[PDB]
Amino acid sequence: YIPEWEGRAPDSVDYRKKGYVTPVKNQGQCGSSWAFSSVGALEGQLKKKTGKLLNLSPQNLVDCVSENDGCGGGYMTNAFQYVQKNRGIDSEDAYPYVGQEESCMYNPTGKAAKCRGYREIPEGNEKALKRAVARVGPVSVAIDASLTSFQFYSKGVYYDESCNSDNLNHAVLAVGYGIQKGNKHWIIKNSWGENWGNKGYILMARNKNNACGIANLASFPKM
Ligand SMILES: NC(=O)SCC(=O)Nc1ccccc1C(=O)O
């Protein structure tokens, strides 16, 4: 067997076709994009591990990941380490999202997935992020989403040269990649509801010198 960091990745990958991606969620006013990005990468690894997939609980992460700040931001790697230490993460149905930080309500009964660690993509290496998406699955990533051009995206492959790759303020999920009208892109799942962008998704420029810092905080959990 030839490992992940070696040889040719396919030119087009989309896990929305293969049942590795849950429907688009809406984080509301709570600044918990790290939680939705974390559960999104955990859902994809749950599908490859068990063959079954299920909507996991970002509220579990908001209320229980003490290393993060609930609605005040957080890192996706701390959520992965939490699930590893906690031995489990609850389902969305058993731990619904309320849009606020509350007390930790984890119960092992509603456990739907586990995690045994994580791996951080080499800093700014878009080729390595591409190989990871093609071989591991959906990868949690952080970007600069403060620009007006990003927030009012609707169609096409998004690119803005003013995007600060050193101000990663929003967490999303790379559910694939490809090419549209001569512009390479990452297929990115956001958490601003289905009515944002293109059905909740945005195609962000790929191989344009790590636009918006797409590969500066990329990671995936291990199951
Ligand atoms: N042996 C390898 O690492 S090749 C992986 C690969 O297919 N990369 C690519 C494939 C198509 C387009 C762009 C890239 C890129 O380099 O970002």
Return the CA Rg of the chain: 16
Beta bridge partners of 201: 189, 198
CA separation, residue 205 to residues 4, 31, 54, 97, 182 (Å): 23, 25, 29, 31, 11
To test the ligand 1 pocket, which listed residue (4, 11, 127, 183) has its Cβ within 8 A of the most ligand atoms? 127
User: Rounded CA gap, 164 and 187, in Å?
Assistant: 20
CA torsion through residues 48, 52, 57, 61, sign: negative
Coil, helix or strand at residue 32: coil
User: Rounded CA gap, 25 and 43, in Å?
Assistant: 13
- Using the atom order of ligand 1, give the atom closest to the CA of residue 128: 3
3 Cβ below 6 A of ligand 1: no
User: Rounded CA gap, 116 and 66, in Å?
Assistant: 19
Alpha helices in 51-179 (DSSP H): 58-64, 76-86, 126-135, 148-151
CA separation, residue 137 to residues 5, 19, 40, 69, 213 (Å): 14, 11, 10, 27, 19
Beta strand extents in the chain (DSSP E only): 13-14, 89-90, 111-113, 118-120, 139-143, 157-158, 170-180, 183-189, 201-205, 219-221
Tell me the backbone φ, ψ of residue 89, rounded to 5 degrees: -135, 145
148 Cβ contact partners less than 8 Å away, ≥ 6 residues apart: none
Distance from Cα 196 to the centre of ligand 1, integer Å: 30
Structure-block tokens of residue 126: 């878009």
Q: Tokens 């790697």 correspond to what residue?
A: 77
* Structure resolution, Å: 2.2
Coil, helix or strand at residue 96: coil
Q: Contact, 158 vs 150, CB < 8 A?
A: yes
User: Rounded CA gap, 68 and 173, in Å?
Assistant: 18
Would you give the distance in Å from CA 211 to the centre of its chain? Answer: 17
User: Rounded CA gap, 156 and 45, in Å?
Assistant: 28
Looking at residue 54, the DSSP 8-state letter turns out to be -
Distance from Cα 203 to the centre of ligand 1, integer Å: 18
Tell me the backbone φ, ψ of residue 152, rounded to 5 degrees: -105, 25
User: Rounded CA gap, 110 and 17, in Å?
Assistant: 27
- Using the atom order of ligand 1, give the atom closest to the CA of residue 206: 17
Coil, helix or strand at residue 70: coil
Structure-block tokens of residue 5: 């960091």
Q: Tokens 């992940």 correspond to what residue?
A: 4
Taking residue 150's Cβ as centre, other Cβ atoms within 10 Å add up to: 19
The upper half-sphere exposure of residue 9, i.e. CA atoms within 13 Å in the direction of its Cβ, equals 22
Which class does domain 1-223 fall in?
alpha beta
Experimental technique used?
X-ray
Structure-block tokens of residue 47: 């599908």
User: Rounded CA gap, 129 and 82, in Å?
Assistant: 23
Structure-block tokens of residue 117: 């660690």
Coil, helix or strand at residue 144: coil
Distance from Cα 11 to the centre of ligand 1, integer Å: 8
The upper half-sphere exposure of residue 174, i.e. CA atoms within 13 Å in the direction of its Cβ, equals 34
